Amino acid sequence: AMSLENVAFNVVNKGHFDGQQGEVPVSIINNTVYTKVDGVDVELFENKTTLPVNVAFELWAKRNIKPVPEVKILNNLGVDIAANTVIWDYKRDAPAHISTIGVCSMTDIAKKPTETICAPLTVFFDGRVDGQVDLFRNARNGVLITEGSVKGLQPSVGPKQASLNGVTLIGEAVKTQFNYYKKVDGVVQQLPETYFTQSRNLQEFKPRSQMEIDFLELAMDEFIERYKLEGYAFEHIVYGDFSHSQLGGLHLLIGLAKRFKESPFELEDFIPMDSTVKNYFITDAQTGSSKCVCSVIDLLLDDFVEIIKSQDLSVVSKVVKVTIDYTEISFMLWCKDGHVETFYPKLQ
Amino acid sequence: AMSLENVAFNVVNKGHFDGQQGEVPVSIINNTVYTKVDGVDVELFENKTTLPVNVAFELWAKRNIKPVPEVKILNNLGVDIAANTVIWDYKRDAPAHISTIGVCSMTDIAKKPTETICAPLTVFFDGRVDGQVDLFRNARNGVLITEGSVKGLQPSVGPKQASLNGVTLIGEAVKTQFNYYKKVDGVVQQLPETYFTQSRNLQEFKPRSQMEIDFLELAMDEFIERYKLEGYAFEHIVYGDFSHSQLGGLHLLIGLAKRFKESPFELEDFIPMDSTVKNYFITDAQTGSSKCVCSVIDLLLDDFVEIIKSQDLSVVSKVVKVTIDYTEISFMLWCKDGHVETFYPKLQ
Amino acid sequence: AMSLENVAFNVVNKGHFDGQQGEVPVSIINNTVYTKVDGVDVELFENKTTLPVNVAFELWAKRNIKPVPEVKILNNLGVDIAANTVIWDYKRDAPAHISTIGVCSMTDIAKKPTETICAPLTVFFDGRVDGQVDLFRNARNGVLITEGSVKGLQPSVGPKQASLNGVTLIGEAVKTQFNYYKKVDGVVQQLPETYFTQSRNLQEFKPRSQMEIDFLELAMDEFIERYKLEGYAFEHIVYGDFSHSQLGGLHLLIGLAKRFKESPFELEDFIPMDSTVKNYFITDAQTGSSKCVCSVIDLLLDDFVEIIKSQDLSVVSKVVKVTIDYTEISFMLWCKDGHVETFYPKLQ
Amino acid sequence: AMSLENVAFNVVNKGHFDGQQGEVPVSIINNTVYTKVDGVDVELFENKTTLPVNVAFELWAKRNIKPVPEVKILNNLGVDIAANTVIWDYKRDAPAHISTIGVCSMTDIAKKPTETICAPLTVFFDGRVDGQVDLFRNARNGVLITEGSVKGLQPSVGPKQASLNGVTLIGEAVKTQFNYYKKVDGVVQQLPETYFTQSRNLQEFKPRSQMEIDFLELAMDEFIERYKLEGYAFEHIVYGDFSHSQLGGLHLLIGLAKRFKESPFELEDFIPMDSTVKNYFITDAQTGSSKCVCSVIDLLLDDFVEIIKSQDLSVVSKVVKVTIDYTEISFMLWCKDGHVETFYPKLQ
Amino acid sequence: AMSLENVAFNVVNKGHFDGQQGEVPVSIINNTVYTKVDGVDVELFENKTTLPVNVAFELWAKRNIKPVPEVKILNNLGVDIAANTVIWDYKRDAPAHISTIGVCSMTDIAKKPTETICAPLTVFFDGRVDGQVDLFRNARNGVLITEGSVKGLQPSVGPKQASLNGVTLIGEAVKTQFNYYKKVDGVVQQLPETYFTQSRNLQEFKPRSQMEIDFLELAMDEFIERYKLEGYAFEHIVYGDFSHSQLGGLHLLIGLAKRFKESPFELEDFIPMDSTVKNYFITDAQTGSSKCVCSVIDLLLDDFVEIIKSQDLSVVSKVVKVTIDYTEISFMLWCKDGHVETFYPKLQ
């Protein structure tokens, strides 16, 4: 007995949809949902999606409020739809997926992931919900997350961090590190060995190793001497070159964080969505050095050092493929006389 | 001789409506009011209200620019409408009241509060405006604020703070502490003895007593020992419990401010309006501890200590009613073996 | 072969329009442009202009990404249109000019600035683009910027700072100080001797002289004694008077920056656009001192001292005209007994 | 190399999308597409769909301009999608289907109906397009229309009429009567014996038999005597009873057409879509007789007489199922003492 | 002292803008202007233009309510702007021109047509307004209409019909036939010999000659015999060929009017604007004969006969240029063995 007024009642009284009975007066004007409180209209939701306002309001109310995989992981694993939940994309302020299963009558393609319409779609299953591990076993295509072992299913240990109501975090009171499983055409797929992006912010950047503490504290030349990085072009790739009109390198988030402490800069997120590699139009405020497309990845500095130190430096230019967040990331490696000139996540 | 172009002229030249003569070219497109400056359109106002764009623009231009009672106080006193002014609600970016008296032809129910349509409504009167004290005396229902004594009318000393153009402050150059009076059905009502909320922000929180300085500076155990708060569950209620998936307690703003200095958190204001008790969907970023409905009140720590220390702790569960901002706030008091387990502003 | 899908392709792949071939699927809903990525819609642009959404999207994509004069300089020089580029106004999130020349078929009045429709308009020319110095020579009306000398054309050295993708900066890796030239009715005009505004922010304010370091570090009385400013009303004009309900003086940005370090305040930008003199409705949060129209100018303190010390202080009230950013700024000078009472950028 | 500007160029020059090269300037404002002609904006399309304005404009431009089956026939046959065409629904001013195959990049689920995504969907194939008969033979699910015989496949003769640019007609210069074929899970179905609705208008109603000429020309009693319809309640069912507050019967379009010649009436199409049975809220203007839900079907009078004369009239109330337009239509048959009381297309 | 409220007051009381003092309460919601009457909102104007709603409302209120030249005549004469009036385009529900002179502060480029901004624009002058004949004499570019002779200037007799509040008519109580004059670069032009379109409707078509009475009354073969039109393909061009899937000919409005009496048809006006030649996507309802682009012109049958009988019929295909409504209309003339095959207004 789903309704707009019942969804709004749950939002007002429970902070989100919680299956409670009740109705509150609602008014819809343009792309905003309001409710009357003390005689005046109070905004409950502003539709930033391409779905109708009342439909997006119901999907947002029915969002998953447990720690869930970050949308970039779900996209890299080919997830098309979620089973009986909504994975809300807080970077886009929209549902991560077009359709639903057992959530909302307007967006539902099926009520259960067992319907034949779900067979060709990669359905997201959550082992924390009763019967979802078994639904994954019977699904033709799907991705499963669990907190423990599944009998006979070989696990892939995912990232330490998960998204809880839009906050990316490594859980202390809740579990955020899941076992990951994937099935393509009825066959459980071996997830590849992968690095993970650290999902940090530029404003609240914190080092997660002794090498990252030394990058942020030590000067460029003493850091490169301490970690034996001579000939690996860290001056260009990680630190960044701000001497010319075109900004050189600056592809690691830690390098942007070190620069951010000294001088500010504009990072234009021209495709605003969660992704393993992010592209920004950067403008350095101190120098005026800029780059239209500056690919940035948040790898742990130790992981980036391991990647670049494991490459053959005897070829002028080559594509280096590295698995990060379960996806193959192509990097462009440019060398000269046995030393690195540049290394960057290749712009497609 | 009111007009859209005249309202816009006053906004451009005087910063708000100031009864001046003149007109500027205006363009309305969707919910925004623009004016032509140097050949280009410059935004003057974005309608975030449920009123028509030109009507909301005129009410915002005609907003009260003197320190006025915060909307939560006006709502707790049952204020329906203001006399010949607009109380702008800066938390909702909308007028605090549906209708006006002597302000705008589109929203006016009357030109003077003496019209019979105003008799059943609780009209807000401001003693700082000539003839408004007398209009309150003749009103059937109303709320009056004054800077001094009114002959024969027993005053209620309101909060130290008032809102001046959306800034809540305790006035030094202006008076913000008013005498409050209320009339229901022609009869002046005795306003109850009340506590006041402190109206502080989490980002700019400042202690307003020696006990509040000690809460923020001292460790949990030495503070509870110094102020003899053993057995009053301050560890749960004020400090907050972040060890389980459900966030425990955290109902006093000062407790959130102390936590905010160490680790950040998301506070989702799902009913965004000014109220004595606020409800937030909180997510602790450090631990992942969360609570869908976490009621928070900004009381002075000394006032909260006085409330909890004045309760009988011999009953398992009971409703404790405390007058705060002239309204009765129900608190849920849970005890065991003569000690507090929890105390929180009861979720309705 | 211009198209919406081609503009969006360039934005997605190049960060802006870069003349590349290709098309991406686009969806327009209301005032927002989206593109499909991984099956979901991702916002590329939100129209904040009065132009149609697809037209504004194309003008924003075709924005000048080289350091350009700040819109206030272009407006003060009478610039109506740009030659074969779009000067994007980042303070208004809109094009600085109504029409274009050789940019977009919907906004174009001409394809080349040589068309007779451009003769009466003051066209902006950029000497950094091939053939634009010659187009200025043949234009009836225009403004030219160059990085070096133009044979026979007497230059005017502009401000040190320029806007690069909305970031105002003094270039280190790029040139931001241009030579300025102007022509009215076929005749090259002598640009007047002028002061320049410093274009600083209140949050990131940095002193640019020893006098500005002393203003921010020294107490009011020792600063006024050190720089011999007794009788020049700096206590009122620069420091500001917060003792009465009406805020006194506070017309220099450096004075607001000094106050901002101690106590916060609301600055309501009621005409949000780039201008030499800005008008704000200010509310001091500490005292409650407020002013509906507080004119603020960001001059270097040394420049403001030179202006006020070069005035005759023997008249009660007079208009003082000072050239700032190539425009004549009227100031109101009020004196008594040979001393300054107030000096402010005159409210029109 | 599809684009908004190219789609508009085709609309302007060819009256619809015709694969021609070219671009015209376009402006999108709200839900309307305009083009500049002689300096002014001219409306090309108003979006009445739930799709984004530019997407709906492209689907409308790419509509099928050949006589196609009426949407009610396609829906009754379970058609989900069309192969490389858009069946435009002129009753809804929207595409008849959610997705496309080889039409528009925004709505396409596949470029060819041979893609595995199309296998479970009932794809509409048109034998008039080269290779579509063979695509139907290889499709798992589909509906095929042809103008002549298909080797091996036994045909179902469809209705005489088809929709050509929203005009339902029986072709004289073009063929509108198609052979219909259908496959479910790779098996060619035996389409059932079916009646067809005549798809006539109330304003331009024309009789299509000698019995229909006699219904419109003769008086009620002489018509019922001539065709031996005594005891079949035609006075109620077809002619209509306007003597009570509730309008009696009036379920055949021919009966409404006969009434329309004498007196007018309001027919409120509360679910505006193409369907075998239509429901209207009818108000007779002459008498004031009204009915909230008056089901109307346009059957040939001879076909309706054959249906009612082939029923058992010995039961008080029963559901009578009739295959009309290939779908099962339920009728409610009410009898008393061997005579009809009422017979109507069941409201369910 | 122009205002939204004053424009609305005039609309309500005078039926249009009439320079009366007064103000009525107005509400703007989306693209509609409302006024409060007896407590409820009543729609005054729905914006169908690309201008802001309040600007379009004011231009519509300030529309010319005297018989004015039809927009197609003004466009063909190169009219850019009107002098101190608004020519409302009722076919587009929008102003015929982008800018105004002395009408509305938002659209005005000048207050008088004597301003230098108006010199290069072809300004429309109306001799019925005092001083406009003299303003035309002093204008560099312009078009003048008069009811009588102008000393020294030789006139061009325009069409009999004019538009009065959107009704095209030949005046009986008012004069609608104007003398036309035109100046280009200060020189009075010699307007060319021109035919005029008759501007008739299909639903209210009336013959305006004995030949037109005979076309509508006589049969095809006796009409062609009476007016000696054998070999001129009137069977195809004027009568229309409905025997094939592609509708043949049907380019004269009189031919469509004759067909309309017998059978109905859909005329899709895909570029809805006033033009000498109109293009329609036609669908004949009786036969199903259709044509995507069917150019239609409303010439007097005698004028069309004179044009086709004055052509050389010895070439297979050629462009025939005819001055109609002062513009050059291209026709395509196809011949074979000395006889016409087709003649149509060229689609270009």
Ligand SMILES: Cn1nc2c(cc1=O)CNCC2
């Ligand atoms: C943690 N980790 N991940 C990977 C590899 C080595 C490693 O230590 C090798 N490249 C792909 C993924």
Ligand SMILES: Cn1nc2c(cc1=O)CNCC2
């Ligand atoms: C300041 N203050 N206010 C109140 C009470 C005691 C007190 O000291 C008693 N509870 C209600 C209100």
Ligand SMILES: Cn1nc2c(cc1=O)CNCC2
């Ligand atoms: C740098 N500078 N500019 C000006 C003046 C003196 C000066 O030193 C005189 N007033 C107008 C402009």
Ligand SMILES: Cn1nc2c(cc1=O)CNCC2
């Ligand atoms: C007795 N009787 N009852 C009904 C109907 C016809 C009738 O004769 C038709 N609608 C449902 C109820």
Ligand SMILES: Cn1nc2c(cc1=O)CNCC2
């Ligand atoms: C032979 N022939 N060709 C054409 C036309 C008439 C004709 O007779 C008219 N449209 C263009 C092509």
